[PDB]
């Protein structure tokens with residue numbers, strides 16, 4: 001049984017491990033490995049401090065998924081946030097990304113953001129299917145935005161706007 | 164009265180910060196509403212020069228009256244990509260100077276080895292849009308309500324060029 005809850009400092013080390021494992025698959029995230037443990041700590045505690053939406057899915061006191069919205073710094077952009085998420089392989093395709101994504105959205109809307117945006121590889125059909133089901137709209141395509149193994153991948157930009 | 168375009172040097176930092184501050188403070192075109200503090204701008208200009216990232220100034224009577232620059236993406240999967248920004252003092256607009264600054268700046272980006280140059284523009288900035296179209300940027304999509312300037316939402320257009 002999986003519990004979804006706000007990330008705490010207690011979770012950082014296990015989160016680093018989930019992130020690193022998803023990055024290492026090299027077909028979903030913009031990173032190829034997690035950032036070092038120490039960068040990931042500063043960031044998580046930065047997020048915690050500022051009350052930015054950041055949820056982990058926990059099974060057996062281990063983080064098996066995460067979903068977060070980072071608010072933009074820049075004053076003209078501070079009504080917007082950027083979503084990122086990921087789930088360990090065993091836990092995918094069983095409705096958990098939907099649940100995680102609803103918690104995080106509800107917290108971003110509570111926080112007072114107007115606009116949530118994401119970027120997804122054009123070949124990531126399961127991520128795209130989830131985002132469409134949730135209500136994100138396609139806003140365009142960045143040609144050759146990502147280079148992973150000597151290969152260029154497009155990224156689809158998508159967005160949702162709170163009513 | 165002659166404008167010259169050249170790579171930015173350490174001495175341009177203060178003139179450049181004033182240019183950036185004048186154009187930002189108009190609050191219609193740029194995504195920052197004010198320049199970053201001078202010493203913040205100096206750090207960023209020293210770094211660009213040192214790491215060879217394309218950054219050009221237009222110079223008239225010793226002053227920086229315009230700039231165009233390309234910031235390289237940090238992450239390893241996005242490092243073949245650069246983000247373009249540019250601005251010109253009001254008296255020097257609409258005279259072909261942005262087109263010249265862009266040409267020089269894109270050519271240096273291509274020489275450096277970048278594949279993809281990307282930009283965001285306000286949907287209502289018709290002059291910047293027309294110049295980007297003319298130079299050969301493609302539209303890549305429209306971000307709804309992506310910009311808020313003083314309680315008003317603006318769409319942003321994403322555009323990009325790919326070097327062949």
Ligand SMILES: *O[C@@H](C(=O)NCCC(=O)NCCSC(C)=O)C(C)(C)COP(=O)(O)OP(=O)(O)OC[C@H]1O[C@@H](n2cnc3c(N)ncnc32)[C@H](O)[C@@H]1OP(=O)(O)O
Nearest residue numbers: 192250251256257258259260261262283284289290291293
């Ligand atoms: O005008 C310059 C500028 O600095 N404006 C203020 C700051 C700014 O917008 N920064 C860039 C956008 S920040 C962002 C998020 O994008 C810029 C926009 C830099 C252009 O430089 P120049 O004005 O020197 O451009 P120039 O090379 O003369 O070419 C202009 C081009 O556009 C046509 N044109 C001018 N004005 C308009 C309007 N209002 N509507 C449609 N088209 C316009 C001129 O006719 C030129 O096009 P061609 O005829 O040559 O096609």
Ligand SMILES: CC(=O)SCCNC(=O)CCNC(=O)[C@H](O)C(C)(C)COP(=O)(O)OP(=O)(O)OC[C@H]1O[C@@H](n2cnc3c(N)ncnc32)[C@H](O)[C@@H]1OP(=O)(O)O
Nearest residue numbers: 028086087092093094095096097098119120125126127129
């Ligand atoms: C840059 C980015 O946004 S990518 C960040 C996204 N992260 C990743 O891609 C990392 C790895 N993948 C994952 O972590 C997860 O698969 C997520 C986060 C993308 C999606 O979460 P999950 O829990 O798998 O999704 P969930 O079960 O809620 O829903 C998935 C949907 O995809 C459908 N689907 C699954 N695989 C495919 C496929 N290959 N083709 C088309 N549709 C698919 C499912 O049927 C379901 O839609 P439905 O309920 O309409 O039938």
